[PDB]
Coordinates of C-alpha atoms and ligand atoms in Angstrom, one line a residue:
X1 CA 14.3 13.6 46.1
X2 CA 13.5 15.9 43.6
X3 CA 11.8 14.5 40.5
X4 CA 13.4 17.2 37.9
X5 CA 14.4 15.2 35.2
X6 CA 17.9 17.4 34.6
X7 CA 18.7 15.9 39.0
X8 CA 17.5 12.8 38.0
X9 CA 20.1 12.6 35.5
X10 CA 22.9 14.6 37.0
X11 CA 22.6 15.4 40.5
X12 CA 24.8 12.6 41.4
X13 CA 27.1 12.4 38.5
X14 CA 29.9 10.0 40.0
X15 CA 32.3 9.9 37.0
X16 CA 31.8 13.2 35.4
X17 CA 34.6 13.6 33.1
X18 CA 33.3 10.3 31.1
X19 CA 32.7 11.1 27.7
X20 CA 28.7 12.7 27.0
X21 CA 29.3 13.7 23.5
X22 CA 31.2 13.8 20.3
X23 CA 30.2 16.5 18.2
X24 CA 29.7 16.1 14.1
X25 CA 33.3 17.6 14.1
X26 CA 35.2 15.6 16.4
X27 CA 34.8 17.7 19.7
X28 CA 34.2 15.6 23.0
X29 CA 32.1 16.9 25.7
X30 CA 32.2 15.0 29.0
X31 CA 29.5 14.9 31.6
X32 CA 30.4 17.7 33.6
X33 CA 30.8 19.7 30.5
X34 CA 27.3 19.2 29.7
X35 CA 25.9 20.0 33.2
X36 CA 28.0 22.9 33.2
X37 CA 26.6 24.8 29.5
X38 CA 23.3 23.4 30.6
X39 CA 23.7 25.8 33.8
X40 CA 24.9 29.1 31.5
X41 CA 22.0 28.3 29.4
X42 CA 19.4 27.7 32.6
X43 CA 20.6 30.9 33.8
X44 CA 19.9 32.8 30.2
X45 CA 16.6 31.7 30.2
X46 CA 16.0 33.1 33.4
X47 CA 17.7 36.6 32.2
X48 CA 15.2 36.1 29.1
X49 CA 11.7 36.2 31.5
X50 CA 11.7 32.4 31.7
X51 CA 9.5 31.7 34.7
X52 CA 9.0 28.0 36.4
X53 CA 6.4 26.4 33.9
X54 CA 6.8 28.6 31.2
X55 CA 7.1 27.0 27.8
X56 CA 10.3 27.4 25.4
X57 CA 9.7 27.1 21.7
X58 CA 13.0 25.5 19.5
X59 CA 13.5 25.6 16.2
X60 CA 16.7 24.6 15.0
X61 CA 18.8 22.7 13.3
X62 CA 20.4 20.1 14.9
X63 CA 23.6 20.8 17.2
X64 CA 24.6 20.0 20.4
X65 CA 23.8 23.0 21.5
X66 CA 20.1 22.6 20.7
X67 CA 19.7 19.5 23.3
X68 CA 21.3 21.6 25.8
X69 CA 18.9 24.0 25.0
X70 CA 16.4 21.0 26.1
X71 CA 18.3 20.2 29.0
X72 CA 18.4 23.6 30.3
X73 CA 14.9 24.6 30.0
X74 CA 14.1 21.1 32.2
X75 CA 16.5 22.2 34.7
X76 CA 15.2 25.2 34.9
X77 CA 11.5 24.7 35.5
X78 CA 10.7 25.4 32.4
X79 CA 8.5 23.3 29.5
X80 CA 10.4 22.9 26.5
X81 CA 8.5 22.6 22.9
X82 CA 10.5 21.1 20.1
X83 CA 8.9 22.2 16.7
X84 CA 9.7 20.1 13.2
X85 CA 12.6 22.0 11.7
X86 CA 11.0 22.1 7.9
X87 CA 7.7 24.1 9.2
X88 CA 7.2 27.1 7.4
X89 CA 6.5 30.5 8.6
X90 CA 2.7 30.3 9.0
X91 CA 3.0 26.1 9.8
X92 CA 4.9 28.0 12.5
X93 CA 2.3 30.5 13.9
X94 CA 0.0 27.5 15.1
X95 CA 2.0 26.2 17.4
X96 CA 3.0 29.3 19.0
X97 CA -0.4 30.7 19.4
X98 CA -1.7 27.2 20.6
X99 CA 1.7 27.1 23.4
X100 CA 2.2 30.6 24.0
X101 CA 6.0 30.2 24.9
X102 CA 7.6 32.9 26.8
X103 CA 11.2 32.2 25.0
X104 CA 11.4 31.4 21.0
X105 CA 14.5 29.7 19.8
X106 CA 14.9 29.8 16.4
X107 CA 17.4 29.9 13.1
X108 CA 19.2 33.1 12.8
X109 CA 17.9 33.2 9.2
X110 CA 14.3 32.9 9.8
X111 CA 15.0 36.1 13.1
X112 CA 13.1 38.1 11.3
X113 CA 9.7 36.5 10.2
X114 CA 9.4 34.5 13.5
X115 CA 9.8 38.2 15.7
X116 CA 6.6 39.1 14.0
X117 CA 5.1 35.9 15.2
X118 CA 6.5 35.7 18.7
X119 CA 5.1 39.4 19.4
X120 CA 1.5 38.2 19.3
X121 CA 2.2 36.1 22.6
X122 CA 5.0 38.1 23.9
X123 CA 7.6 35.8 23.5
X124 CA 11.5 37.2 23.7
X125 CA 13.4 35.7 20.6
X126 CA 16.6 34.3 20.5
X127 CA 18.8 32.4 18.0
X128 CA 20.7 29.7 17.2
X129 CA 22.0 28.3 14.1
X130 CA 23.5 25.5 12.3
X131 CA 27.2 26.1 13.6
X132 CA 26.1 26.5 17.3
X133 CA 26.4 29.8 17.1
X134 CA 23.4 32.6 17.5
X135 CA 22.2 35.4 20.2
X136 CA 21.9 32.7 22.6
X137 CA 25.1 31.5 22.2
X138 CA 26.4 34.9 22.6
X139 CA 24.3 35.3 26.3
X140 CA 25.5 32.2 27.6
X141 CA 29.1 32.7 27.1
X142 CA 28.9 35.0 29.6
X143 CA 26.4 33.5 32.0
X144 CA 27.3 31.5 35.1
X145 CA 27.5 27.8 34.9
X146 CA 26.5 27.4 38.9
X147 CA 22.1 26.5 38.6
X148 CA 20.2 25.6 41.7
X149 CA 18.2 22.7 39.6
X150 CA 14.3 23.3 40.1
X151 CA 12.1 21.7 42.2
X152 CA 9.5 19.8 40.6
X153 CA 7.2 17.0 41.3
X154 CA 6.4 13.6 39.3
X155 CA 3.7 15.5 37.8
X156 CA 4.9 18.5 36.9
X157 CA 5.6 19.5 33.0
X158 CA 9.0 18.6 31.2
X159 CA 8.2 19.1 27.7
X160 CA 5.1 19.5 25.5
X161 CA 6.1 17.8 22.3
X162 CA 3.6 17.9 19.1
X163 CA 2.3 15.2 17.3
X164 CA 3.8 14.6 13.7
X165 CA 0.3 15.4 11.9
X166 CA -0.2 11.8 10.1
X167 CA -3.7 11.7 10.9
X168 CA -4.8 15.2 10.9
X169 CA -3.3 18.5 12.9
X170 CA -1.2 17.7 15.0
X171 CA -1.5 18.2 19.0
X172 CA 0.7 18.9 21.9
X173 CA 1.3 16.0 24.6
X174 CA 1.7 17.5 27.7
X175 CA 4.8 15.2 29.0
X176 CA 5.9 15.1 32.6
X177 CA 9.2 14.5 34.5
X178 CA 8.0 11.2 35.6
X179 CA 7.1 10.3 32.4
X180 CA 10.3 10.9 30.5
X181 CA 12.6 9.8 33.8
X182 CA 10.3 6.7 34.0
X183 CA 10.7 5.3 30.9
X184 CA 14.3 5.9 29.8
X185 CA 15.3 4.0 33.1
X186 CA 13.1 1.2 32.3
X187 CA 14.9 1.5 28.8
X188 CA 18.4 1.7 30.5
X189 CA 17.7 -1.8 31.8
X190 CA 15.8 -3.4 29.5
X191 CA 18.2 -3.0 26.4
X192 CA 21.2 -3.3 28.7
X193 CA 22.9 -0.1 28.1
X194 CA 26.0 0.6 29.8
X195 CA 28.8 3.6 30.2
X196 CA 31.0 1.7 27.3
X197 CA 27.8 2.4 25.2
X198 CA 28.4 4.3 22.2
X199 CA 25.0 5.8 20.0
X200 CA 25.4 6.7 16.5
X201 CA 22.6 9.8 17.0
X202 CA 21.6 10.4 13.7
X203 CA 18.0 11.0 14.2
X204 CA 15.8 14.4 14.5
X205 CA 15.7 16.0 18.1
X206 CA 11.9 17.6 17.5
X207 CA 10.4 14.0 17.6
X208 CA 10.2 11.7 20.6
X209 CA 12.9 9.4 19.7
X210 CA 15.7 11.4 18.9
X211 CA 15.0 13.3 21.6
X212 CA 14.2 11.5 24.6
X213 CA 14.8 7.8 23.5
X214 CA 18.2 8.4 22.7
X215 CA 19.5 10.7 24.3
X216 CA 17.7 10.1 27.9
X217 CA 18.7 6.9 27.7
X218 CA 22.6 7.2 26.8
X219 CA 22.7 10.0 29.8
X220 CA 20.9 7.7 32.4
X221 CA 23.3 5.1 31.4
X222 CA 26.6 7.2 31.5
X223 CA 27.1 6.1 27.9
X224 CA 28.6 8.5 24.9
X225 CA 27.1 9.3 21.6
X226 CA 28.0 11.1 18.3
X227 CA 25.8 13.1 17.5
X228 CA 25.8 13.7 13.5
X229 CA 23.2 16.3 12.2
X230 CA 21.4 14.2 9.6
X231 CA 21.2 10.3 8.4
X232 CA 24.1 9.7 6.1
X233 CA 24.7 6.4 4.9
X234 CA 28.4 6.1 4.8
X235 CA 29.1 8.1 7.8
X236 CA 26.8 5.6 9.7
X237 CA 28.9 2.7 8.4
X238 CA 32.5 4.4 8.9
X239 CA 31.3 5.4 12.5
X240 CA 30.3 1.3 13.5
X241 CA 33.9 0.5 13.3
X242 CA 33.9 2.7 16.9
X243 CA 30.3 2.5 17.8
X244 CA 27.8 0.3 20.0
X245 CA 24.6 0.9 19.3
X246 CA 22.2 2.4 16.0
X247 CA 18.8 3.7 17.0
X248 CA 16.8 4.3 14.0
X249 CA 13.4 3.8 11.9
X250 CA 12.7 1.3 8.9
X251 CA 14.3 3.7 6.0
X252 CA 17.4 3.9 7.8
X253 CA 17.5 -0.1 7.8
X254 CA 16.0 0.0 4.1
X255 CA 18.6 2.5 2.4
X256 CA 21.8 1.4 4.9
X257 CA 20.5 -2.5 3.0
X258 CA 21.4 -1.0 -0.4
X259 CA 25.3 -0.3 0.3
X260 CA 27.4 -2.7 -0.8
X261 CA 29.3 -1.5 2.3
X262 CA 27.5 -3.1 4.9
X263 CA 28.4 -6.5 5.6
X264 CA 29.3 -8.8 8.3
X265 CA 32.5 -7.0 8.7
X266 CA 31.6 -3.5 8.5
X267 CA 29.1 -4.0 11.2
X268 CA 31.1 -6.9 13.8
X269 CA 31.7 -4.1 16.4
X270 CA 28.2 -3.3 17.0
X271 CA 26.1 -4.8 19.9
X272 CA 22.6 -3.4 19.0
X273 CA 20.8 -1.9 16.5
X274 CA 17.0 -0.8 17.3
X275 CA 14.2 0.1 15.2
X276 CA 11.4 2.0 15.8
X277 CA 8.9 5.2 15.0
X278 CA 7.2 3.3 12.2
X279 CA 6.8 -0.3 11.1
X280 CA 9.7 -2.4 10.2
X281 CA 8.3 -5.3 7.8
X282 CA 9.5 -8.8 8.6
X283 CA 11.1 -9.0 5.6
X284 CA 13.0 -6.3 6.0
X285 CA 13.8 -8.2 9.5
X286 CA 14.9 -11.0 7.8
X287 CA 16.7 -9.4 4.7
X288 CA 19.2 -7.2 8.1
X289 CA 19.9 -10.9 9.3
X290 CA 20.9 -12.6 6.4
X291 CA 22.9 -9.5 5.1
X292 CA 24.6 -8.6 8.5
X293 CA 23.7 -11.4 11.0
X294 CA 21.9 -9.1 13.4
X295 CA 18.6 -9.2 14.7
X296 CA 17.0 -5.9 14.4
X297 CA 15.5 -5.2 17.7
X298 CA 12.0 -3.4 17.4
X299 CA 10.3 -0.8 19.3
X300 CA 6.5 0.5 19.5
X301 CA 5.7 3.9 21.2
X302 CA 3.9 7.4 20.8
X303 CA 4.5 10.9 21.5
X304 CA 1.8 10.4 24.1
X305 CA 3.1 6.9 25.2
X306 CA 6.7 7.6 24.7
X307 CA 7.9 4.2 24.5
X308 CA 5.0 1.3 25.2
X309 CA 6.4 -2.3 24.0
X310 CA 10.2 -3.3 23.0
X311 CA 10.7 -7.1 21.6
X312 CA 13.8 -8.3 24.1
X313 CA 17.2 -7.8 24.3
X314 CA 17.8 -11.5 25.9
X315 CA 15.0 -13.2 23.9
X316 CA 13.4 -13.8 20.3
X317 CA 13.1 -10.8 18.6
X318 CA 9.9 -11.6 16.4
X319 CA 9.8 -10.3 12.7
X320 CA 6.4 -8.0 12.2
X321 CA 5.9 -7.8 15.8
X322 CA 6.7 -4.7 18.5
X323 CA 7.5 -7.1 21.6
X324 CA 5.7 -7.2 25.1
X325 CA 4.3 -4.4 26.9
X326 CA 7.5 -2.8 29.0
X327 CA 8.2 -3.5 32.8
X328 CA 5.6 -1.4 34.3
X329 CA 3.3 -0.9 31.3
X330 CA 0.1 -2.5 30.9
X331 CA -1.2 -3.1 27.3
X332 CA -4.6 -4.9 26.2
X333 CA -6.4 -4.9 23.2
X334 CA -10.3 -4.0 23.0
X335 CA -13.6 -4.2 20.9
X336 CA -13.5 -0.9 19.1
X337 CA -16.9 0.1 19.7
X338 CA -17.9 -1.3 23.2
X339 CA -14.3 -1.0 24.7
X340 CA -14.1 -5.1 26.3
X341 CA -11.0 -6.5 26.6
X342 CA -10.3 -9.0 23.5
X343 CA -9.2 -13.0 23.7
X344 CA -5.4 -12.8 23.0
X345 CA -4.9 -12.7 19.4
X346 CA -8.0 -11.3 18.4
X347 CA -7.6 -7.9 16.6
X348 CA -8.9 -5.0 17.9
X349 CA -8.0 -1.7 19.6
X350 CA -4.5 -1.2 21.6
X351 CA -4.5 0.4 25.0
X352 CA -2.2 1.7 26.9
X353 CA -1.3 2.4 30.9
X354 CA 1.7 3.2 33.0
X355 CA 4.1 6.2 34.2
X356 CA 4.9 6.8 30.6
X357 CA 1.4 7.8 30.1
X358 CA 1.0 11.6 29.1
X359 CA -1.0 14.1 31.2
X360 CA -3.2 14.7 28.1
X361 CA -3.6 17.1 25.2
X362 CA -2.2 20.7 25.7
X363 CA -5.4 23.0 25.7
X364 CA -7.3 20.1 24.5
X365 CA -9.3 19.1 27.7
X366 CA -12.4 17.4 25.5
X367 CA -10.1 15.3 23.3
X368 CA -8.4 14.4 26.5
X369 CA -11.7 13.2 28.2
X370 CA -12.4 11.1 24.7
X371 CA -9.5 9.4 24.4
X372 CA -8.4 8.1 28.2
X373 CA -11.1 4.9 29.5
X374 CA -12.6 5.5 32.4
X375 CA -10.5 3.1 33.9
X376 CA -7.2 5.1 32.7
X377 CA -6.0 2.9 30.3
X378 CA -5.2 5.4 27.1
X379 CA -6.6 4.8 23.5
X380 CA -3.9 4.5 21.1
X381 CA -5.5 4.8 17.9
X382 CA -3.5 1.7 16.4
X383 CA -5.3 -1.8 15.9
X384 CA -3.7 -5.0 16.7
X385 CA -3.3 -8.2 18.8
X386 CA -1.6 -9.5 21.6
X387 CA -0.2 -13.4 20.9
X388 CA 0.0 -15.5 23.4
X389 CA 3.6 -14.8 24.2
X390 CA 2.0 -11.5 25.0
X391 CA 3.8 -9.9 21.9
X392 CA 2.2 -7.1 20.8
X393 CA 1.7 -6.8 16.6
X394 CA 0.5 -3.4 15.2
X395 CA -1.9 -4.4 12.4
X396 CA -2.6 -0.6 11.3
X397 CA -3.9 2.7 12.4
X398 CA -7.5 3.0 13.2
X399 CA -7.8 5.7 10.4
X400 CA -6.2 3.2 7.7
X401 CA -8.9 1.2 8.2
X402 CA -10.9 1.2 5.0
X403 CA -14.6 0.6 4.7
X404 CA -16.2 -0.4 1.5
X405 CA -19.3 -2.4 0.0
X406 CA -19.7 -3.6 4.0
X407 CA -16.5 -4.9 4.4
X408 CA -13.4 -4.2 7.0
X409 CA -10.6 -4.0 4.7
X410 CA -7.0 -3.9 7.0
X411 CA -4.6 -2.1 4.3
X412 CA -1.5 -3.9 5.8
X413 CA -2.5 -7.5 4.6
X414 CA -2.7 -6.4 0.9
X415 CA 0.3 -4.0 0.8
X416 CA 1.9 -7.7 2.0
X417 CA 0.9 -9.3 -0.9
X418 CA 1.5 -6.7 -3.5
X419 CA 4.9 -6.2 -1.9
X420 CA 5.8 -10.0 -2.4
X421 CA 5.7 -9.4 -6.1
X422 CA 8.9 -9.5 -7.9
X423 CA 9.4 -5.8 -9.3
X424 CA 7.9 -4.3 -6.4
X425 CA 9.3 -1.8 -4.3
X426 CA 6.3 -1.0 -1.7
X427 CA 3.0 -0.5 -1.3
X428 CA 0.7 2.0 0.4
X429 CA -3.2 1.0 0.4
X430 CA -5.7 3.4 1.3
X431 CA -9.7 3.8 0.6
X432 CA -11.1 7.0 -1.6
X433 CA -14.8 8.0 -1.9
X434 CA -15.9 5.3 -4.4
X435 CA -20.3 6.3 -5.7
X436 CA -20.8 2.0 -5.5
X437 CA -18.9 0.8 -2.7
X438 CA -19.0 3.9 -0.2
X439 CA -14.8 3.9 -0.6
X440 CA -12.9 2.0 -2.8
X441 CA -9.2 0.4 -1.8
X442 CA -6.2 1.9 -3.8
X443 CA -2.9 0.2 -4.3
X444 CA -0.4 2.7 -4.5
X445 CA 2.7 0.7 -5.8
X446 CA 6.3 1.7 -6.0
X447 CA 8.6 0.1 -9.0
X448 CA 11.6 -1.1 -9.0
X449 CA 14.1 0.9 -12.1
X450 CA 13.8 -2.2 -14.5
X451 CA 9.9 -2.3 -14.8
X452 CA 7.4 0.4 -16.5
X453 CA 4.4 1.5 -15.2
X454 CA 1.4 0.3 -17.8
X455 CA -2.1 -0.9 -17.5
X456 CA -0.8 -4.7 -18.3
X457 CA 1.8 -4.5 -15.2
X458 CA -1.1 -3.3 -12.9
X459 CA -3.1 -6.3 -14.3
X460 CA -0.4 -8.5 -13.4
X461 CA 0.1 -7.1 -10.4
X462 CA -3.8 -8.0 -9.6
X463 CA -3.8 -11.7 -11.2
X464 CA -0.7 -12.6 -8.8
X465 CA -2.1 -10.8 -5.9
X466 CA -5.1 -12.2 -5.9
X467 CA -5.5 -15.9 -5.2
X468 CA -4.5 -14.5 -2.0
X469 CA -7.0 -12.0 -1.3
X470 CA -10.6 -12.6 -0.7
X471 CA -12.3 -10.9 -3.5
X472 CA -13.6 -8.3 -1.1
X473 CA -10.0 -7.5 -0.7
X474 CA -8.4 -6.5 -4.6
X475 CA -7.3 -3.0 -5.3
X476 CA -10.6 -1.5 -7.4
X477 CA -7.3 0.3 -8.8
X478 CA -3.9 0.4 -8.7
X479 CA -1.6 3.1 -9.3
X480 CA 2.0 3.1 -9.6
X481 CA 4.4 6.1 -8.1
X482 CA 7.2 7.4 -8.4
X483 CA 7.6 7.7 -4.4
X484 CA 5.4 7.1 -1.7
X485 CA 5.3 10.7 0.8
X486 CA 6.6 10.4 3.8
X487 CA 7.0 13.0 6.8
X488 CA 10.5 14.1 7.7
X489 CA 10.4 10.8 10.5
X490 CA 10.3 8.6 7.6
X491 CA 6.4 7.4 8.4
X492 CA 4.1 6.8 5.1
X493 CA 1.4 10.3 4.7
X494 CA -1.4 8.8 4.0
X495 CA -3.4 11.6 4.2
X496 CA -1.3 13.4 1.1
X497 CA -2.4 10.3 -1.1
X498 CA -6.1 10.8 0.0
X499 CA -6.2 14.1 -0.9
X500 CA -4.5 14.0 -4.3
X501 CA -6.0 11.0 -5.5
X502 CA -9.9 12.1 -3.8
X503 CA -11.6 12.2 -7.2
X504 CA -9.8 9.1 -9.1
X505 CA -13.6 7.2 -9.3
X506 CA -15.2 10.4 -9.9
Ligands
ATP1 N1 7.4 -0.1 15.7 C1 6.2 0.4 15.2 N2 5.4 -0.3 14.4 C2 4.3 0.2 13.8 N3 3.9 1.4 14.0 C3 4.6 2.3 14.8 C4 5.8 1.8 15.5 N4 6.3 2.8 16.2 C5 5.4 3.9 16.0 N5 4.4 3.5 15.2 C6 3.2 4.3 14.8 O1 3.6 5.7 15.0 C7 2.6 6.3 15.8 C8 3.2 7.4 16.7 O2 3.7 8.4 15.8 P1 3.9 9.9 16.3 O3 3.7 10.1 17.8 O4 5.2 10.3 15.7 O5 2.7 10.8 15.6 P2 1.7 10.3 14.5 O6 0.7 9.3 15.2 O7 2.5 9.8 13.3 O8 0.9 11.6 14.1 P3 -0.5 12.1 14.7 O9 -0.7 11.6 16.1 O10 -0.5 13.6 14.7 O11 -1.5 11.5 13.7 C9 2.0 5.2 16.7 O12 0.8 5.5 17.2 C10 2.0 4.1 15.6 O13 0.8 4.4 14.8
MG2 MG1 -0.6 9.7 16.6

């Protein structure tokens, strides 16, 4: 009975030299493989100060050895703390001031630099690199592979992962063993995953999807996956002929669309290909099916949430929508301001409750308190509707919403329209300070090759827009990009446009 996420997944392991993992290279790991380096590196930790509760800090590159390094920490009581690969030095110090890990993982390269900054806290630094290779390598090839797993209850912590910083700085979700265990069964079940399953892993391992999503639930289902260190187009398509399934977010679906590879043929041995981490746009839905013939199968969650709503694997999968709240979630939508539970398909606020519900903000009691209802039902900072299929739709972020001359203006209904013009790319539509109408909506628009940015193209743009759009509604002005910024998940930064483009109606 114990709750550990690491016994959950392996204390009864009744085919254990089943296939875990092929490596970028070509080398298999089985089950019992994995258990056993997870055990040298439990036992490292332990030799490193690692005490039950402590947190462990990662920052890596991607390897199988890094999610053992996950694995291990788990098993051994410990909390582990994935941090983005491309943060700087000082990006860096934040997080390990604000988590105060007893053990830093990091890139031989950056030993150095990130000593200084694991000495404020008292942190013992080891390293791993690219290759698999480091000072923790090098301790755990001499380490035992016998681990007595740790107790730990429902409750206890498993990992705090940090929020990727779209809205502002980003926060640690304290994440529990029930949470994680909880939700990657439900997922197990719910997209019918099975030990002939075979993930094409091809996703970061600091963000929730990479990281628990796929790799909790290929390991709760006895399935395999290759796990390849970045997203490459044409080693995603070779690796179909001999794969299952493709977890992955809209740009993976947007760029794999522009290989004349990727047909019918070149994808006829897959069963399933998700989407999820940021919106995938009914057309691009539709433009997957006719190009392919498969439905795209879309998923909504949160760091905080991990996952909340999946459209189904044995029903319609809807274009533009996120699917019904999981088996044992409860979602509802809610007036913004007094917090009442909304008609279905009125827009409002979505909210959130069930065991994949964090345990709140890491060191962030007050923000905790603010964002739970008093009922428990978590605020999830995204607006939308339930239809009355009980399909969730994501409409926007609360913080997208732009307010200007007294009207709500929802940014996703005119990026729609602009983005239905021949010549564009997409869209990103966000309000700046504007001295007449409080703030003013920008259309940031992305070209395609053959067409030049001018003024007359921008009025174009705005006269087809534009019989669509109540008048309250057109772009005050639109500029064209080379590029709209996007994190290293692939999700649109608002926030970077806002800030460059603060003073255009100054
Ligand atoms: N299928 C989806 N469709 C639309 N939006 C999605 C989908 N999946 C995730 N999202 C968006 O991504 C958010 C979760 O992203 P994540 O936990 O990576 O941090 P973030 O919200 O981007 O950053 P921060 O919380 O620091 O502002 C959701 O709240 C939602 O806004
Ligand atoms: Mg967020």
């Amino acid at each position: 009975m114990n709750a550990n996420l690491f016994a959950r997944l392996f204390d009864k392991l009744d085919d254990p030299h089943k296939l875990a993992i092929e490596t970028a290279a070509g080398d298999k790991i089985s089950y019992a493989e994995l258990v056993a380096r997870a055990g040298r590196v439990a036992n490292v930790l332990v030799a490193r100060g690692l005490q039950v509760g402590d947190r462990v800090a990662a920052q890596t590159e991607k390897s199988v050895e890094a999610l053992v390094l996950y694995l291990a920490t788990v098993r051994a009581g410990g909390v582990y703390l994935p941090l983005n690969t491309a943060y700087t030095l000082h990006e860096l110090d934040y997080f390990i001031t604000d988590a105060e890990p007893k053990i830093v993982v990091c890139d031989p390269s950056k030993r150095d630099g990130i000593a200084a900054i694991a000495a404020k806290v008292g942190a013992t630094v080891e390293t791993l690199g690219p290759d698999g290779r480091g000072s923790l390598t090098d301790a755990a090839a001499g380490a035992s592979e016998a681990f007595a797993t740790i107790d730990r209850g429902a409750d206890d912590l498993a990992a705090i992962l940090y929020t990727s910083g779209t809205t502002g700085r980003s926060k640690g979700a304290m994440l529990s063993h029930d949470n994680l265990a909880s939700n990657s069964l439900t997922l197990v079940d719910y997209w019918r995953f099975t030990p002939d399953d075979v993930l094409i892993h091809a996703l970061p391992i600091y963000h929730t999807h990479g990281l628990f999503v796929a790799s909790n639930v290929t390991l709760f289902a006895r399935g395999s996956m290759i796990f390849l260190p970045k997203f490459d187009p044409d080693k995603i398509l070779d690796l179909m002929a001999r794969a299952t399934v493709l977890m992955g977010v809209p740009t993976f679906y947007t760029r794999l669309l522009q290989s004349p590879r990727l047909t019918k043929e070149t994808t006829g041995h897959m069963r399933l290909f998700i989407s999820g981490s940021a919106p995938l746009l009914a057309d691009t839905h539709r433009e997957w099916s006719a190009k392919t013939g498969h439905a795209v199968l879309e998923r909504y969650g949160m760091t905080e949430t991990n996952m909340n709503t999946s459209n189904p694997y044995d029903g319609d999968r809807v274009p533009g929508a996120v699917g019904p709240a999981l088996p044992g979630v409860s979602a509802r939508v809610t007036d913004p301001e007094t917090g009442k539970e909304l008609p279905r398909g009125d827009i409002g606020m979505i909210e959130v409750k069930g065991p994949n519900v964090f345990k709140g903000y890491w060191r962030m009691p007050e923000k905790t308190k603010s964002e739970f209802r008093d009922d428990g039902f978590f605020i999830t900072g995204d607006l939308g509707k339930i239809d009355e299929r009980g399909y969730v739709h994501i409409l926007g972020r609360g913080k997208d919403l732009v307010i200007t001359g007294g009207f709500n203006v929802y940014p996703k209904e005119i990026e729609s329209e602009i983005d239905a013009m021949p010549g564009v790319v997409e869209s990103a539509v966000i309000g700046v300070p504007h001295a007449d109408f409080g703030e003013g909506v920008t259309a940031f628009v992305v070209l395609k090759r053959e067409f030049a940015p001018s003024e007359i193209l921008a009025e174009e743009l705005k006269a087809f827009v534009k019989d669509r759009l109540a008048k309250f509604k057109m772009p005050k002005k639109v500029i064209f990009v080379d590029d709209l910024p996007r994190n290293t998940m692939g999700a649109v930064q608002k926030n970077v446009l806002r800030e460059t483009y603060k003073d255009i109606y100054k």
